[PDB]
Amino acid sequence: GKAVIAIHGGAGAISRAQMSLQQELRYIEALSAIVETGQKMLEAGESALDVVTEAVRLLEECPLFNAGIGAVFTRDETHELDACVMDGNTLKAGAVAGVSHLRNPVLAARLVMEQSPHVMMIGEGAENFAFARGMERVSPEIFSTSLRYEQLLAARKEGAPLDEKQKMGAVGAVALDLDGNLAAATSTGGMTNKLPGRVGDSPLVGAGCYANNASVAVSCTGTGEVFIRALAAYDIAALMDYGGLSLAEACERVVMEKLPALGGSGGLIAIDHEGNVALPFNTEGMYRAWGYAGDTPTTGIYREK
Amino acid sequence: GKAVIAIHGGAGAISRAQMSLQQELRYIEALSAIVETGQKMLEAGESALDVVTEAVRLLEECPLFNAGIGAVFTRDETHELDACVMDGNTLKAGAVAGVSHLRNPVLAARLVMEQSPHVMMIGEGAENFAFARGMERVSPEIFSTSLRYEQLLAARKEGAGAPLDEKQKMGAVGAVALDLDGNLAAATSTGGMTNKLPGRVGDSPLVGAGCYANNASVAVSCTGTGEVFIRALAAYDIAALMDYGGLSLAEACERVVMEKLPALGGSGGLIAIDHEGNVALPFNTEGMYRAWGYAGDTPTTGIYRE
Ligand SMILES: [Cl-]
Ligand SMILES: [Cl-]
Ligand SMILES: [Cl-]
Ligand SMILES: [Cl-]
Ligand SMILES: [Cl-]
Ligand SMILES: [Cl-]
Ligand SMILES: [Cl-]
Ligand SMILES: [Cl-]
Ligand SMILES: [Cl-]
Ligand SMILES: [Cl-]
Ligand SMILES: [Cl-]
Ligand SMILES: [Cl-]
Ligand SMILES: [Cl-]
Ligand SMILES: [Cl-]
Ligand SMILES: [Cl-]
Ligand SMILES: [Cl-]
Ligand SMILES: [Cl-]
Ligand code: NA
Ligand code: NA
Ligand code: NA
Ligand code: NA
Ligand code: NA
Ligand code: NA
Ligand code: NA
Ligand code: NA
Ligand code: NA
Ligand code: NA
Ligand code: NA
Questions:
Q1: Burial (0-12, 13-18, 19+ Cβ within 10 Å), A294
Q2: Residue B219 touches partner A, C-beta closer than 8 Å
Q3: Which residues of this protein are annotated with the site description Cleavage (chain B)?
Q4: B106 interfaces chain A, CB cutoff of 8 Å
Q5: Parallel, antiparallel, or unpaired for β A266-272 and A93-99?
């Protein structure tokens, strides 16, 4: 009965020649474990929303990906995290941007959705709201990793299978559940050497995250400014819904044509209401995985064959 | 098509019985002067971008509308302001949210567009970036007004003025314009919502939700209950319905404002100009503070029903 999940962990240029297989396998194992968790939840009748929330939570926890633990550093050597989640069944959405004292932004985004009349909260206000609902306050030092610090130092001067450049790491999940509900979630640490207070596409409904039962669930990763300006995630939905494009056609138009034409780089993952799955990326590679409920998953980092 | 400007200063329920004519005239005159200024600029060959920036700046300055001076108060008796500007010719955009120490958020938004490689900046980071560009730091007390303070007090009291009742959320300001060179632009600014949870963001600073412009389709600025405008991507949905669905501006506005948004429990309106110079000011509320005019013609102003 067509339940399916896809996940991503960022996009970038291929650096396989500098990697050992054992290094690559750490990424593959991470992606495999999370997608398999998602598939299991789906086959057991869990909701798309719960599935994308848990998958993004696990991706935040994984230090290899730019969200939560493993977040990139800002120019001030701090971390500012953003996340979004959307329920295609109700069209409700929750989002946080600019948070430093919450371990799992996607769970905070979810709290904004389910435990407030709002869609988006920012900064200390967002944190205070979450703390008032019992979410633990953490120090942002928990997110810090030497790989991302190395990259900050290289960035301000004049280690992974993919080179994200400064902006193209982020994480996300999309799912269609056994009830026909679509959901999407996205989380990020932003961009290496970011001007504090800058916001990219990840937490913005219709830019980095979108879900609607009648069309598509989408999560993006890439150079944020272009994905905002082109409403990348909603554009997929609109092309299909109004233009009558297939998911594949819509993905080609956005990722391979429109975004590049505006100078945007990255990719996205998408599931449509008929259970078609697509993981387009205009970069050389993208950390990714997907699988139908009850089938064996597929993972990838580099080019498709 | 022909150069044209529209503006809004928020939406709401009609509260005429409590007004005198002379009070209403002050609102009509406020709207009229701003739209006239825009028309003049358009006639003089000024850019859509410059026009919508200036109109929204004037609307922020005007204490009657919820943006800049006259901003609503948060739960904590503070002001947190948000703004967006979008250039339809380049598809660049600039936005600030959660700013308290900048007199004119739309000018800060324009600064994000033009003097940073970014599209959106929030809070103190946004403020610091503006200051670094020589923008003046102000104290938020400058925004405070007696009308809005009383609205906060009423919100705080347990149970159930101006020509329109914005309720808590439906006040914002905005402008859309088509210039003599065929460019579309949009800008939106807000003080947010009365008794707001600090850190909450509505549709106004969000590209595609409260503000959108693309020379190939439409310029749009919204005002209403923000959450629904975000979830439905009101501004870009107009563009997408026209561009991909083939709907006229009239059809797209009807679909979004009168059908889709209400179906999600949303209330408010928007202003829109398409690339062919058609202008629409739809609102599913009883009224909307609004005005528009073609360059070289007399403007039209409205508060209550069409
Ligand atoms: Cl690449
Ligand atoms: Cl290589
Ligand atoms: Cl090996
Ligand atoms: Cl909502
Ligand atoms: Cl917790
Ligand atoms: Cl980004
Ligand atoms: Cl297109
Ligand atoms: Cl485009
Ligand atoms: Cl691979
Ligand atoms: Cl009345
Ligand atoms: Cl009277
Ligand atoms: Cl840009
Ligand atoms: Cl200044
Ligand atoms: Cl709002
Ligand atoms: Cl529709
Ligand atoms: Cl009303
Ligand atoms: Cl009347
Ligand atoms: Na992580
Ligand atoms: Na909510
Ligand atoms: Na729909
Ligand atoms: Na990114
Ligand atoms: Na590619
Ligand atoms: Na004002
Ligand atoms: Na910019
Ligand atoms: Na009350
Ligand atoms: Na509003
Ligand atoms: Na286009
Ligand atoms: Na109406």
A1: exposed
A2: no
A3: 171-172
A4: no
A5: unpaired
